[PDB]
Design a protein around this nucleic acid. Structure first.
Ligand SMILES: [Mn+2]
Ligand SMILES: [Mn+2]
Lengths: 151, 128
DNA sequence: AAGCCCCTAGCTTTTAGCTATGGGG
DNA sequence: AAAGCCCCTAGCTTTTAGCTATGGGG
């Protein structure tokens, strides 16, 4: 796991973001799909967001991004959907005439880290004495990174 | 993990947040430690933030919290650090006299989810 | 725990189109 | 060191304070 920092925060903020076109119309196909990803990449590039992975289904776009926690994941999302909708609808007439808006007013957001929730929770508990979790091997690299970043 | 939602978003945003007192003074102990944790819960309640786990070292406070993406993790943090600084320094003389500020301008924030990163990166790759 | 419909101001994409711990049905 | 120390604006809470901002300088 690699950490970045703005002027005041050290962070690692990865989000699995998903959103679908309006009425889940299966429009994210062909040139629309390829164009959409290109627009998202340029939006991320200028908004200093790192697209770790991004794939499209026919009525879904999955994005795994690292976003500055102070910038705001929603600021990235609003920009990506807003611009892509404005552009795509200009380029592909069918999205303009057969749909009131390209996207919906919602999305799905889930945080992603280097280890599953339970181990981080475990590590937090241990702090009160910091003896040794003894685990085995499992998740030792992650926990090692942490204790180092905190001393 | 059980997803929540506001009016327009289904989410699960858990962060591991860590911050320290000014100059890393091992001051988070006894009455102070207890009062700080109290203030944090008080603030989280007020700000609809779920504190999944919170423990203090002596120059660190760890918090695992689920925060609304639209609300903002920083909004939770500034309130938590700011109010706790105000109150603690009001309730503990040694904290106001020996330090210019209780906290620092920085903090550590690490996102956490049900699965590790590579697992989620693979799952996404399989969407083709 | 959204996804449909409708609405508003804010802000971008501005003769658009998506947010807001938005609000209502 | 920079996140952490120093210093500053500016926005908002905690406002006879004290922490933010994809902030910015040593
Ligand atoms: Mn600074
Ligand atoms: Mn899918």
């Amino acid at each position: 796991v690699l950490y970045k920092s703005n002027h005041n925060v050290v962070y690692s903020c990865k989000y699995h973001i998903v959103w679908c076109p309006k009425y889940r119309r299966k429009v994210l196909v062909g040139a629309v799909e390829m164009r959409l990803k290109e627009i998202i990449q340029e939006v991320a590039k200028e908004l200093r967001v790192e697209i770790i992975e991004m794939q499209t289904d026919k009525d879904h776009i999955h994005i795994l991004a690292d976003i500055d926690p102070s910038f705001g994941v929603m600021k990235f999302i609003k920009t990506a959907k807003g611009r892509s909708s404005r552009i795509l609808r200009q380029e592909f007439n069918h999205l303009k005439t057969k749909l009131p808006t390209l996207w919906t007013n919602s999305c799905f957001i889930s945080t992603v880290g280097g280890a599953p929730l339970n181990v981080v929770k475990q590590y937090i508990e241990n702090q009160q004495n910091s003896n040794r979790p003894k685990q085995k091997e499992k998740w030792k690299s992650y926990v090692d990174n942490l204790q180092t970043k905190a001393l």
